[PDB]
Design a protein around this ligand. Structure first.
Ligand SMILES: O=C(O)CCC(=O)C(=O)O
Ligand code: PRO
Ligand SMILES: [Co+2]
Length: 280
């Protein structure tokens, strides 16, 4: 299971515009804000109970049910009906990233008894929106249905004035990946997207490690966000931010900041429990 395009669909811009206008005014969940650097957020379209109040994810066996929000988005409802198997869906969300926001580099599923198969259908995006995986950066285009191997280190950012919205579907984890996307066109091969990021250098590295002189509890959040965003513009690994933070704090020499840095990396990449939240 490599991250890839499963298929491509035609989006109907008129009907899409209508549902996007409703989502622009919708109440988004604050759950998993511990993963957000800025305005990375989602809302529930389908979940276990069909209730708007149910906003965290667990592995379960129920064909997901449309929430009231779900029901008020009839075109997105239709897409879900037509391009996936109903009984295989466990969640469907809209995930929006607004200007200069990202989800912090992480792996998913650590707190879950099992995994999902995570699928993105891109609704509204642009050239300044990126997803990343390990050492790579790529753009998921409008109408593309992508399988995301969320068990690998990854992130996603939006660096445009305009927000980016993806329909994200969690399919029960033992399903056959080739069977997931229904009624889709096979994508043609295309030009590889070349990685336009800057080469990482000893200068850029020393500059980052220089924050050892100023890092404190008062600016920790800002520094973490800056570090998280670097791999969208420099050729470095998703996870390198955590090594940088650890070395920044080792040089600073304050025990509290070193412990936090260890916990940060651990929570996002190594180990966390069900319902556990990372406040930093
Ligand atoms: O593209 C996004 O907003 C989120 C990417 C991600 O971390 C996920 O879907 O697991
Ligand atoms: O798996 C999930 O849905 C949450 C959201 C991002 C981090 N983990
Ligand atoms: Co993820």
């Amino acid at each position: 299971a490599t991250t890839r395009i499963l298929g491509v669909v035609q989006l109907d811009q008129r009907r899409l515009t209508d549902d996007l206008a409703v989502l622009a005014k919708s109440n988004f969940s604050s759950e998993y804000s511990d993963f957000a650097c800025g305005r990375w957020e989602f809302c529930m379209l389908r979940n276990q109970s069909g209730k708007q109040e149910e906003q965290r994810v667990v592995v379960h066996e129920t064909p997901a049910l449309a929430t009231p929000l779900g029901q008020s988005l009839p075109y997105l409802n239709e897409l879900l009906d037509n391009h996936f198997d109903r009984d295989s869906i466990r969640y469907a969300r809209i995930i929006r990233i607004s200007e200069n926001a990202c989800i912090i580099p992480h792996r998913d599923y650590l707190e879950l008894e099992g995994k999902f198969i995570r699928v993105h259908l891109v609704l509204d995006t642009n050239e300044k929106c990126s997803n990343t995986e390990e050492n790579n950066i790529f753009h998921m285009g409008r109408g593309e249905i992508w399988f995301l191997d969320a068990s690998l280190p990854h992130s996603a950012g939006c660096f445009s004035p305009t927000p980016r919205l993806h329909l994200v579907v969690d399919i029960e984890g033992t399903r056959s990946l080739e069977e997931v996307a229904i009624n889709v066109e096979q994508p043609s091969a295309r030009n590889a997207t070349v990685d336009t990021r800057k080469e990482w250098t000893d200068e850029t590295l020393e500059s980052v490690l220089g924050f050892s002189e100023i890092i404190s509890e008062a600016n920790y959040r800002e520094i973490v966000a800056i570090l998280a965003k670097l791999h969208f513009f420099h050729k470095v690994h998703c996870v390198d931010m955590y090594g940088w933070l650890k070395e920044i704090c080792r040089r600073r020499g304050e025990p509290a900041l070193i412990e936090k840095a260890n916990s940060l990396e651990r929570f996002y990449l190594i180990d966390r429990a069900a319902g556990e939240v990372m406040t930093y």
